[PDB]
Amino acid sequence: DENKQKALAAALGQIEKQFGKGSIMRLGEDRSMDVETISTGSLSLDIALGAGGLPMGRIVEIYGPESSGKTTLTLQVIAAAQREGKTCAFIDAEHALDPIYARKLGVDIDNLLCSQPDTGEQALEICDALARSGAVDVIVVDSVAALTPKAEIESQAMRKLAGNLKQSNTLLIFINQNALKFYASVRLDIRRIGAVKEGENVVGSETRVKVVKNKIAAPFKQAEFQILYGEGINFYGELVDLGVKEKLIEKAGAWYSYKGEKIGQGKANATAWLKDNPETAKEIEKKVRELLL
């Protein structure tokens, strides 16, 4: 019993000492590695990640079918980073960025560095150079599948990239539509699981993200949220549901209320209220994070 508990603790400790704190974990442990993170723009996903956002200095992979929300997520990560004065770069092989939508999500387009590489090797070399500069905080590559080998147009790189990103504390996200599978500290499976309709017209998509790999906190948690056309992740909608779940917001059938006052009849109205009262929303969000992180 106690003897076995001590033997297990020691064994797990030796494993962590040899391979790192995130090398083995109990799926239910409420502990996370002390790591600097950048918000994904989704409250439920920041919670599912355990650390409250994506880890700096690491490689992250986000994959899923076209239109599942990969680009939207990375643009919101960039916006979050830029708000904190961080320098971001976008390595593009898709040729599909919409600056109007990006600005809507909060991205400072004017200060976003961008490269549209001729070959996959050039793209990786540019990433490594930005990584080695110690002056770039976030790099987004969209997408992996578009990176065509030079030889074709006419593993070793990943190892060096990972090392350089770690040394400079640079977060790098690969959007994908074994090297990456193994070098990534976080891998996200994102998919559209339904449509959001304001009556009879489709205005967005119901989205689900599974954290299939997580080396900074317990893996396999999931997040669900809506992505509204031209607006991005419906953060306040997530806050309504999580506020209720943590018993910070009461739901009397269809009426939602906070601290004894109604904020809206129906999730849509409750969401709008939080959005129009950001100072209070920030307090609820802060409370939710303290409880679930």
The annotation places the binding site for ATP at 64-71
Q: Would you say 41 or 52 has its CB closer to ligand ADP?
A: 41
205 scored as a contact of ligand ADP (CB under 6 A) = yes
71 scored as a contact of Mg ion (CB under 5 A) = yes
229 scored as a contact of a copy of itself (CB under 8 A) = no
- Please report how close the Cβ of residue 265 comes to a copy of itself at its closest, in angstroms: 28
Which DSSP letter does residue 164 get? H
Measured distance CA(67)–CA(89) in Å, rounded: 22
Which DSSP letter does residue 248 get? S
Q: Which two tokens stand for residue 132?
A: 């080695």
219 scored as a contact of ligand ADP (CB under 6 A) = no
Q: Which two tokens stand for residue 123?
A: 């793209």
* Residue 145 interacting entry, from ligand ADP, Mg ion, a copy of itself, none, C-beta within 5 to 8 Å by type: none
The piece of 70-78, 118-126, 161-169, 215-223 that touches ligand ADP (CB under 6 A) is: 70-78
Burial class (CB in 10 A: 0-12, 13-18, 19+), 87: middle
72 scored as a contact of Mg ion (CB under 5 A) = no
Which helix (H) or strand (E) segment holds residue 163: the answer is helix 156-168
Which member of 70, 187, 209, 232 binds a copy of itself (CB under 8 A)?
187
21 scored as a contact of Mg ion (CB under 5 A) = yes
Which residues carry a binding-site annotation? 64-71
Residue 236 CB coordination number (10 Å): 22
Measured distance CA(276)–CA(291) in Å, rounded: 24
Residues 127-146 close enough to bind a copy of itself by CB under 8 A:
129-130, 132-136
Which member of 32, 68, 176, 226 binds ligand ADP (CB under 6 A)?
68
Measured distance CA(261)–CA(9) in Å, rounded: 48
What secondary structure does DSSP assign to 55-68, as a single string?
ETTSEEEEE-STTS
Which member of 30, 36, 98, 283 binds ligand ADP (CB under 6 A)?
98
230 scored as a contact of ligand ADP (CB under 6 A) = yes
Q: Are 147 and 93 in contact (CB under 8 A)?
A: yes
- Please report how close the Cβ of residue 110 comes to a copy of itself at its closest, in angstroms: 3
The piece of 48-56, 65-73, 126-134, 237-245 that touches a copy of itself (CB under 8 A) is: 126-134
The piece of 73-81, 181-189, 240-248, 250-258 that touches a copy of itself (CB under 8 A) is: 181-189
Residues forming beta bridges with residue 122, ordered by sequence position = none
52 scored as a contact of ligand ADP (CB under 6 A) = no
Residues forming beta bridges with residue 204, ordered by sequence position = 196, 228
Q: Which residue has the tokens 């949220």?
A: 225
Measured distance CA(263)–CA(32) in Å, rounded: 34
84 scored as a contact of a copy of itself (CB under 8 A) = no
224 scored as a contact of ligand ADP (CB under 6 A) = no
Measured distance CA(52)–CA(47) in Å, rounded: 5
Which residues are near ligand ADP by CB under 6 A?
Answer: 64, 66-72, 98, 101, 204-205, 227, 229-230
